[PDB]
Amino acid sequence: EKVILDWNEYIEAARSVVSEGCVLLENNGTLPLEKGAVVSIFGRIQTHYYKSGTGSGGMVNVTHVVGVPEGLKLSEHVTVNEELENIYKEWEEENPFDEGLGWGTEPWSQPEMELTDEIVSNASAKSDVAIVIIGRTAGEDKDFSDVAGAYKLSETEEDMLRRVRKHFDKMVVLLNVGSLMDLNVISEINPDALMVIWQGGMIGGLGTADVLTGKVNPSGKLTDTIAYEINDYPSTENFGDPVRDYYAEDIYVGYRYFETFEKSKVRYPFGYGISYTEFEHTVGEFTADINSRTFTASCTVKNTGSVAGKDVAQFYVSAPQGKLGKPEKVLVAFKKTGILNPGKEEKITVTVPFDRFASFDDTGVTGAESCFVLEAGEYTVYEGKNVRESYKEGSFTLEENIVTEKLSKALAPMESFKRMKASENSDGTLSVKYEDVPVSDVDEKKRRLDNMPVEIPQDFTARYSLKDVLSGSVDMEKFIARLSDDDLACIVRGEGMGSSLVTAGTAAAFGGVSEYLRKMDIPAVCCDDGPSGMRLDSGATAFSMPNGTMLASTFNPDVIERMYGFTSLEMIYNKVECLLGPGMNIHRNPLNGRNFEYFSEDPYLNGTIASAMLKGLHKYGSDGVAKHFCCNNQELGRQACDSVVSQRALREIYLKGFEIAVKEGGCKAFMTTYAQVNGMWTAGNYDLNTRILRDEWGFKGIVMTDWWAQVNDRGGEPTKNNTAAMVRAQNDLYMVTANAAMNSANDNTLSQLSEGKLNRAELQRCAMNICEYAMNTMAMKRLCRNDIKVEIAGR
Numbered sequence: 052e053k054v055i056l057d058w059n060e061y062i063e064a065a066r067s068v069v070s071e072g073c074v075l076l077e078n079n080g081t082l083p084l085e086k087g088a089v090v091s092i093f094g095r096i097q098t099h100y101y102k103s104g105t106g107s108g109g110m111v112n113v114t115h116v117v118g119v120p121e122g123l124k125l126s127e128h129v130t131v132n133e134e135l136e137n138i139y140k141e142w143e144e145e146n147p148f149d150e151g152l153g154w155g156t157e158p159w160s161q162p163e164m165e166l167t168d169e170i171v172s173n174a175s176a177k178s179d180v181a182i183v184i185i186g187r188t189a190g191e192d193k194d195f196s197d198v199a200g201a202y203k204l205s206e207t208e209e210d211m212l213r214r215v216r217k218h219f220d221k222m223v224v225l226l227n228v229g230s231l232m233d234l235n236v237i238s239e240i241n242p243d244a245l246m247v248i249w250q251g252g253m254i255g256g257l258g259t260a261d262v263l264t265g266k267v268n269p270s271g272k273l274t275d276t277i278a279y280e281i282n283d284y285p286s287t288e289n290f291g292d293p294v295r296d297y298y299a300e301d302i303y304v305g306y307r308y309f310e311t312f313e314k315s316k317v318r319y320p321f322g323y324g325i326s327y328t329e330f331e332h333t334v335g336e337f338t339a340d341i342n343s344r345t346f347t348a349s350c351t352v353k354n355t356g357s358v359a360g361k362d363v364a365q366f367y368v369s370a371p372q373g374k375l376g377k378p379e380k381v382l383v384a385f386k387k388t389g390i391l392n393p394g395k396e397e398k399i400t401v402t403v404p405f406d407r408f409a410s411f412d413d414t415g416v417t418g419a420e421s422c423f424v425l426e427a428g429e430y431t432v433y434e435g436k437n438v439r440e441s442y443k444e445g446s447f448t449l450e451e452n453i454v455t456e457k458l459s460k461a462l463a464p465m466e467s468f469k470r471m472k473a474s475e476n477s478d479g480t481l482s483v484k485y486e487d488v489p490v491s492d493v494d495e496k497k498r499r500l501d502n503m504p505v506e507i508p509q510d511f512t513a514r515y516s517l518k519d520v521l522s523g524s525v526d527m528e529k530f531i532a533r534l535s536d537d538d539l540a541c542i543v544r545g546e547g548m549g550s551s552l553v554t555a556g557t558a559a560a561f562g563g564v565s566e567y568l569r570k571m572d573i574p575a576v577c578c579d580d581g582p583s584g585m586r587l588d589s590g591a592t593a594f595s596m597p598n599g600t601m602l603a604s605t606f607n608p609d610v611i612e613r614m615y616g617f618t619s620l621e622m623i624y625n626k627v628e629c630l631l632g633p634g635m636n637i638h639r640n641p642l643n644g645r646n647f648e649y650f651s652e653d654p655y656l657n658g659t660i661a662s663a664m665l666k667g668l669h670k671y672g673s674d675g676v677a678k679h680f681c682c683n684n685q686e687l688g689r690q691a692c693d694s695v696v697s698q699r700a701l702r703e704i705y706l707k708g709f710e711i712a713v714k715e716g717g718c719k720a721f722m723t724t725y726a727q728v729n730g731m732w733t734a735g736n737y738d739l740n741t742r743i744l745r746d747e748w749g750f751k752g753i754v755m756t757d758w759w760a761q762v763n764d765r766g767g768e769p770t771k772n773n774t775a776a777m778v779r780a781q782n783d784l785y786m787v788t789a790n791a792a793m794n795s796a797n798d799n800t801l802s803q804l805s806e807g808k809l810n811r812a813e814l815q816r817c818a819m820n821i822c823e824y825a826m827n828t829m830a831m832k833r834l835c836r837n838d839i840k841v842e843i844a845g846r
């Protein structure tokens with residue numbers, strides 16, 4: 052069976068995402084740019100558009116990048132001041148773009164060109180409007196930093212902006228950035244318009260020109276809260292320490308903290324974004340259904356301005372403080388309108404199950420320790436344009452607690468620390484107090500022994516194929532019998548990077564990594580980075596898509612899912628079965644370097660966007676790998692850092708997005724972290740990989756390590772070859788080893804199995820996970836000769 056991947060529709064799908072994810076923050080009418088106008092473009096970064104951040108999720112090779120000057124010219128709606136372009140081009144020949152010396156050594160920004168009264172004054176005389184581009188990038192292993200040239204403007208950048216401001220009376224500022232930066236000094240200089248354009252991949256400039264020229268009306272929204280100062284953020288106090296960080300802010304991350312305790316410290320709230328038109332949000336019908344555990348809220352959005360556009364209806368719940376304490380508001384639903392013509396309107400209706408605003412009782416004060424619960428009291432629903440400007444939509448009251456789900460004491464902290472508590476002063480204001488987090492009392496050895504899987508007796512005369520499991524002819528248990536201990540120790544190894552069993556230049560192969568495993572019709576399954584498109588270290592080119600933060604700012608799961616439906620076909624064309632994405636760690640602090648390839652400070656949005664990306668990839672049978680599970684919110688010291696975090700914060704915030712990816716996204720593959728969560732490495736954590744992921748959420752799939760990650764037993768020394776610890780946790784795949792069949796890493800699987808410290812049943816459990824995954828991949832279909840063939844058209 053054969054299928055066309057139309058490259059022009061793929062470009063157009065990516066172009067729509069860029070055009071729905073730019074976020075307009077301020078505008079006095081200077082945008083959109085007027086038909087026929089001539090624009091002077093400032094900032095040297097205009098010649099080297101940041102299409103992505105740095106590291107594993109930003110090494111997509113491409114033939115050409117459409118930056119902002121080029122996209123504007125191709126609009127045929129404005130012209131660019133070409134003299135000023137030549138000044139930049141000629142200057143850049145003496146001061147070339149610094150690409151850096153290696154891996155995480157490419158700098159945050161480039162040194163800016165100093166401008167003269169002369170150059171700027173002359174540009175003004177020959178153009179109607181200035182556009183100033185400020186550029187920042189970031190990524191793996193370098194955290195962003197509160198210094199000039201990083202979170203702050205450099206002195207020459209600030210100079211550039213002041214000169215431009217003085218000599219032009221129409222001034223637009225674009226931030227070509229992976230993550231948020233300081234807007235204090237920008238807002239003070241006071242440009243006519245300010246827009247965040249993120250990093251849009253290889254067609255960024257096409258979609259950015261669309262919004263700048265009014266062909267598309269900006270409809271993007273912030274996925275984080277922009278505070279006035281870095282010290283205003285609740286996590287800053289406890290972030291950036293390479294050894295250990297205490298998550299004292301607990302569930303009060305981002306807008307959960309600011310809307311609750313510190314409204315005045317917010318410059319732009321979560322969900323904020325404007326348009327070239329204006330919208331009226333009118334509250335509608337509200338009903339609750341306590342027995343179904345849902346409510347239904349309606350509202351109507353009307354376009355009250357002079358140009359067509361989209362807006363986002365955002366719904367929030369205020370839970371009763373009760374005994375646990377709650378944030379003032381939590382996001383539970385959102386819906387972006389179609390394009391609405393002036394004076395037209397759309398009725399928006401959402402149905403919200405109660406589990407979206409439940410709370411996890413980790414202390415037992417509700418009488419339901421280790422449960423998601425709805426405390427007794429009044430639930431108020433709000434609807435609006437953002438979290439601040441959201442208004443009463445409905446309410447209901449519960450006389451008794453409702454227990455939404457019975458879970459267990461899992462992944463609890465091994466030491467005491469103080470966490471934030473919402474305490475209501477007698478005038479009803481909420482203030483920050485601190486309370487002790489209770490220490491874990493789980494006997495981990497017993498838990499592992501009590502839930503030990505049953506061994507399957509080996510049988511080497513049974514020549515059943517994995518094809519026979521797929522057909523239905525035999526049970527998976529019947530097939531797995533055939534695997535020797537050599538085969539079992541081999542199948543839990545990933546081979547890479549650049550294994551010759553799969554497409555050159557990809558991250559790994561797994562499944563059929565020996566001749567003996569391949570004889571069983573276990574196919575070799577190919578993994579490759581990354582969320583923003585295929586990284587091929589062979590140099591082959593692929594589609595470079597917008598960064599994750601820009602994806603999230605669309606607030607539009609359908610536009611994201613359409614794009615990744617094309618990426619689904621591109622993967623099959625390149626014989627890549629598993630894309631290492633989405634990255635979906637929470638934005639705990641603005642200064643985390645990898646924030647660019649993650650989505651939000653909110654877990655509902657974070658999970659909903661991840662799921663959209665996955666539904667895209669699943670369209671033609673490809674797949675994604677959710678990463679990094681969990682609490683990789685910091686790049687500094689990430690090989691050993693210890694995130695010390697409560698169960699409630701874990702269940703409601705850090706794990707919740709991943710939970711949604713499993714239950715709504717259909718996620719079948721997860722990747723663990725390089726670091727520690729509550730006193731041991733994630734790759735060998737039983738509570739994470741078996742208790743929560745499998746027993747509690749019902750995940751049926753594979754877990755894999757991060758690349759060359761360390762693993763340990765609790766209390767023990769970390770090593771890159773303790774695969775027995777990994778298998779005891781049901782982390783199924785060590786990624787990666789140069790040669791798996793020869794045990795190139797000298798792992799301890801077999802030695803620990805002879806000593807009885809690893810049970811055969813545990814290896815067989817991993818092998819059944821690997822095989823059941825592998826048989827539903829496109830690589831299995833190739834063996835069966837029933838796979839999709841892809842041809843590329845429009846080139």
Ligand SMILES: OC[C@H]1O[C@@H](O)[C@H](O)[C@@H](O)[C@H]1O
Nearest residue numbers: 107558580581631678757758
């Ligand atoms: O190259 C593959 C891997 O690389 C690691 O360095 C990174 O933390 C992961 O995101 C993973 O994708």
